[PDB]
Amino acid sequence: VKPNYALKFTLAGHTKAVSSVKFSPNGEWLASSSADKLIKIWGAYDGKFEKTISGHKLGISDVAWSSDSNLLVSASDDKTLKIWDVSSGKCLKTLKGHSNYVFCCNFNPQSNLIVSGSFDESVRIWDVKTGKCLKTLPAHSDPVSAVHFNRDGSLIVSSSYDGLCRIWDTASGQCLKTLIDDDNPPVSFVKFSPNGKYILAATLDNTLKLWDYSKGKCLKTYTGHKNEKYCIFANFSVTGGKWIVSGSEDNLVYIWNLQTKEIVQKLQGHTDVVISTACHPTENIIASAALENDKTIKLWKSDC
Numbered sequence: 472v473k474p475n476y477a478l479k480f481t482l483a484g485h486t487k488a489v490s491s492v493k494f495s496p497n498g499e500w501l502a503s504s505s506a507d508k509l510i511k512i513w514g515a516y517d518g519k520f521e522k523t524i525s526g527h528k529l530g531i532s533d534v535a536w537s538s539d540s541n542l543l544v545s546a547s548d549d550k551t552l553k554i555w556d557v558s559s560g561k562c563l564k565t566l567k568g569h570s571n572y573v574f575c576c577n578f579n580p581q582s583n584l585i586v587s588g589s590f591d592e593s594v595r596i597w598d599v600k601t602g603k604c605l606k607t608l609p610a611h612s613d614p615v616s617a618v619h620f621n622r623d624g625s626l627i628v629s630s631s632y633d634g635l636c637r638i639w640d641t642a643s644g645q646c647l648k649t650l651i652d653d654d655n656p657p658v659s660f661v662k663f664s665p666n667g668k669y670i671l672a673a674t675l676d677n678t679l680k681l682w683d684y685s686k687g688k689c690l691k692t693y694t695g696h697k698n699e700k701y702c703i704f705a706n707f708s709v710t711g712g713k714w715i716v717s718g719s720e721d722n723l724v725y726i727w728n729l730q731t732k733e734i735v736q737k738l739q740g741h742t743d744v745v746i747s748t749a750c751h752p753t754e755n756i757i758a759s760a761a762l763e764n765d766k767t768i769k770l771w772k773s774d775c
């Protein structure tokens with residue numbers, strides 16, 4: 472079986488490259504971040520522009536939702552993260568400490584913590600309530616491309632242009648595991664599978680790999696897309712068929728069968744690198760976003 476994702480909405484408004492799109496956990500909203508220093512909120516189902524959230528002094532690389540869909544965190548080239556009240560659009564805290572661009576951020580499931588990755592080669596864990604840094608992990612020896620909590624928040628995974636994926640005990644900040652192959656191409660993206668047993672990792676050799684966390688083994692490889700330059704997000708689609716979803720530097724959205732590794736669909740429409748894709752938490756909906764020749768978000772819908 473293949474999905475049949477078709478274009479429903481093109482979301483225009485960003486004046487520079489989009490960097491990241493993410494659906495709210497309640498499925499209501501899409502949040503977008505951009506080089507234009509703005510966060511935009513859009514209706515997930517009708518594509519309707521809701522509001523602009525402003526305050527960062529330089530471009531935003533990443534945005535992430537709290538579990539209750541009430542807060543956003545953004546990661547900025549201004550070396551800060553900002554926690555936002557989405558309803559008011561107000562900046563609640565500025566997270567200060569990173570010594571270079573903040574690239575990537577995520578809330579833990581409880582949403583009492585935020586994890587961030589920076590070009591400063593550190594991973595930081597922040598208290599949402601106080602806005603204070605709790606820990607600095609000396610995580611990598613090159614820029615940190617991604618950070619993610621597992622399903623219960625007990626673990627962090629990070630990836631770096633140093634070619635490593637590392638798994639961290641959240642409570643202690645101690646490294647549990649380093650995923651190395653024999654080569655070490657830059658790791659441009661990582662996240663845990665919904666059940667937290669696997670890690671999906673992108674490398675800048677046009678390759679996605681599914682890793683067994685517990686064993687430290689590669690189970691699956693997904694190829695045929697273009698990824699040698701950008702930190703392109705990848706997703707587990709779980710609402711219909713079990714797919715892998717990724718953008719591509721050839722301006723397409725790739726969708727693979729998770730088990731077979733076959734490409735099942737290629738979504739044509741963007742006029743630049745598809746940097747970010749997000750899978751809706753309950754509907755067969757994909758959001759895709761493109762760099763500065765395009766600057767649009769596209770919403771797609773499938774019957775499976």
Ligand SMILES: O=C(NCCCCc1nc(CO)c[nH]1)c1ccccc1
Pocket residue numbers: 489490491532533574575616617618659660661700701702703704746
């Ligand atoms: O990908 C780059 N710029 C596009 C915007 C950021 C996309 C992004 N991906 C993630 C994955 O965690 C977070 N944010 C980039 C790559 C190399 C050097 C400078 C910038």
